[PDB]
């Protein structure tokens with residue numbers, strides 16, 4: 006019947022809050038006189054201090070010392086009988102403002118044809134907090150402010166965002182950071198500056214056996230179409246299948262080969278081989294190793 | 305350079321079509337004079353018959369006898385060199401008008417809380433053909449036209465549609481049929497008339513064993529919450545596990561039982577039991593049988 | 604009786620159903636606002652003036668019906684207008700509240716038609732109501748536990764009146 | 772050379788990429804309209820007046836650049852405006868066409884900037900073009916196979932001009 010009002014409904018960590026109950030005498034059997042009692046849900050709260058208008062409404066104000074509870078309900082209830090009557094209720098939260106998002110990173114996925122950034126948001130704030138991936142076309146060190154900033158918004162919950170091709174400017178540099186805001190504050194990750202093209206994630210060619218001397222092998226590997234268009238460098242590694250032997254890396258390869266022969270092995274008749282790639286004179290990062298291929302040697 | 309135009313771009317089964325090529329002399333080395341040749345894509349078509357304005361454009365019209373091809377391309381090409389020059393092209397389809405959709409039916413799903421109708425569209429028309437589930441609140445035999453008709457549209461490809469609760473009027477009757485149209489015609493299923501509530505699909509309780517004489521059993525089964533609210537009748541059936549024995553049905557049961565005892569069996573020590581349900585004095589359909597429960601007898 | 608077996612059983616279903624409905628809402632108010640006891644809200648109740656429905660033309664006033672279904676029905680209709688005026692309460696509830704709103708609606712017309720199929724239905728279908736406020740969040744938060752809790756009994760009585768009306 | 776190794780290799784990538792792009796479109800026109808041979812369309816070509824790009828300020832006219840990148844670049848820019856004026860052709864193509872449009876765009880500015888990073892870029896960035904019609908379905912269906920097919924060679928030449936420009 007009366008009406009609660011506060012300073013701040015949401016607040017820091019463990020701070021105080023201060024509220025008013027303006028209990029109107031217009032509806033009340035025993036007129037507001039029965040002291041109005043403050044609760045934090047089923048908990049009487051000390052401090053209550055009952056003011057007046059005199060011949061008006063009979064208000065009270067109170068001060069919560071340190072709200073030490075992420076959520077909590079503030080019950081302004083009076084007394085009609087041997088029964089407390091809630092007359093207004095209000096919700097109070099408290100938590101933290103957000104921290105700087107650690108470990109932002111991006112890929113370009115040649116299949117979705119888009120740029121996938123992601124981060125870690127670390128410590129939970131206890132508050133409804135939205136993240137956002139801002140980005141902008143620049144040139145250079147990105148310092149020289151590019152102007153149009155592009156918000157890309159993640160799907161509730163998820164901690165990565167994704168920018169489709171139509172909004173990228175391949176072979177040029179953009180700025181990207183994550184913004185994090187809840188109602189206690191906003192924070193920003195450090196800004197990234199990159200060319201989507203130097204973060205392209207490749208996928209390795211798949212090694213396979215042949216068809217047509219001794220201590221030797223023949224295999225072959227077919228491309229990864231999506232990457233064909235990107236001069237990349239590969240390496241093969243091999244070690245005999247059983248034994249705890251150490252992997253042997255082999256020189257620089259091409260992305261595809263119709264016939265390769267590997268000699269100098271033991272007619273040990275059993276090796277494991279995997280190859281992987283990476284965009285070459287241009288910048289790029291390695292690729293997972295291909296699944297393994299097993300085959301025996303000549304003898 | 306010239307411009308094709310037809311009677312009908314889409315047409316029945318195997319009928320004729322008739323087109324014009326208005327080849328303009330405004331662009332043409334050897335002026336339209338080199339006869340314009342009709343093709344069905346890389347196929348010269350007989351019939352061509354070359355008209356004129358005289359001192360204008362040098363048009364031709366032609367008549368495709370029976371278009372016996374679901375899709376086909378109509379190439380109006382002239383002659384410049386020893387090379388045919390396409391000057392306009394046009395696409396022609398032909399197929400069937402749709403058939404009456406056979407076997408429309410509905411369920412009410414107590415979980416999605418909605419009504420799921422589905423049908424079979426039989427013979428392929430060879431043409432872009434949309435289906436649609438029309439429905440309307442009525443009363444009675446649905447004859448007495450209810451007025452507001454509600455289109456519920458299926459997802460491309462799929463042959464069932466689904467009406468959510470907010471648009472149903474439980475415990476009352478509605479009309480429902482499927483409409484099917486492509487550009488040769490429209491057809492309709494026979495109209496259904498029902499109370500979503502008498503097509504509710506139930507789910508059986510799950511039988512289980514007990515805790516606390518001979519040739520006997522004790523089991524128990526817990527409800528299916530979603531259905532608790534619907535007086536339903538169940539039956540149990542049982543037969544000994546090995547042997548090719550015939551299922552024995554047991555009297556009328558309730559939807560839930562904290563303790564049931566089944567006597568008169570062989571201390572055969574191995575029976576299979578399943579139960580199922582159906583809404584009872586009110587209309588409804590049976591439910592799949594519960595998964596089986598196996599347990600031995602007393603002795 | 605002049606009341607078709609089927610119609611009655613259809614009425615009872617709907618009751619059990621709406622009861623559930625209420626109960627879900629009640630239990631989802633209790634967890635989302637810690638408002639579990641509609642005692643505490645009594646005052647708030649009057650503070651707004653929530654016209655509650657009566658239902659004493661049936662309990663056993665004789666053995667003449669219509670004018671009774673009538674009352675029943677009107678109640679249903681009233682609550683239906685309170686729940687409406689509850690305005691979905693809050694987003695996290697809204698759906699829970701909305702199923703009840705709908706179901707109650709349907710019990711409401713399941714009666715009204717039976718009443719036309721026996722002539723006792725006015726030709727003219729009411730649209731009245733002087734609906735209370737529920738401006739604030741709390742009013743509706745509570746409003747809800749209140750109405751729920753009244754409805755909830757209005758039903759236990761209609762139950763009686765029907766389980767017993769199904770043996771004339 | 773005065774052209775950074777990296778810049779050149781970045782240019783070649785883009786070529787191989789756009790080549791693919793073209794080829795996808797070409798092969799997806801060929802299946803969706805049976806238009807596989809851009810001979811047949813020659814006439815149609817002139818019938819519309821498709822300004823094709825030239826590219827003979829580089830092939831080996833000396834060993835002075837800029838004014839050459841210039842031409843290159845302008846071509847790119849031209850095609851980019853033809854593909855635009857192709858209007859996505861038809862829904863089933865539109866995406867295929869749209870990746871090429873985009874990629875070509877980017878090769879187009881990959882040059883232009885290198886040209887500013889050497890001063891030879893006009894300060895003033897063109898927006899010109901007298902773009903042909905392509906009103907009809909067929910015009911664009913064909914328009915496409917035509918432009919594709921020209922672009923496709925404009926590239927094989929730029930390739931040469933670069934694989935060879937990458938040994939001064």
Ligand SMILES: *[C@@H]1O[C@H](CO)[C@@H](O[C@@H]2O[C@H](CO)[C@@H](O)[C@H](O)[C@H]2NC(C)=O)[C@H](O)[C@H]1NC(C)=O
Nearest residue numbers: 112113114115116117118119121206207208293
């Ligand atoms: C790039 O995104 C593409 C599209 O998701 C990924 O390809 C999929 O990989 C996932 C999970 O490993 C599979 O579930 C899918 O079947 C793939 N294809 C499709 C059509 O969805 C890819 O793994 C992402 N990253 C890389 C390494 O390319």
Ligand SMILES: *[C@@H]1O[C@H](CO)[C@@H](O[C@@H]2O[C@H](CO)[C@@H](O)[C@H](O)[C@H]2NC(C)=O)[C@H](O)[C@H]1NC(C)=O
Nearest residue numbers: 411412413414415416417418420505506507592
């Ligand atoms: C009613 O629709 C509900 C929702 O689909 C169905 O319940 C699902 O059943 C499917 C397939 O058998 C499962 O893949 C899902 O895990 C179920 N639940 C959910 C939350 O999606 C149900 O089978 C449909 N019909 C019936 C018999 O109730």
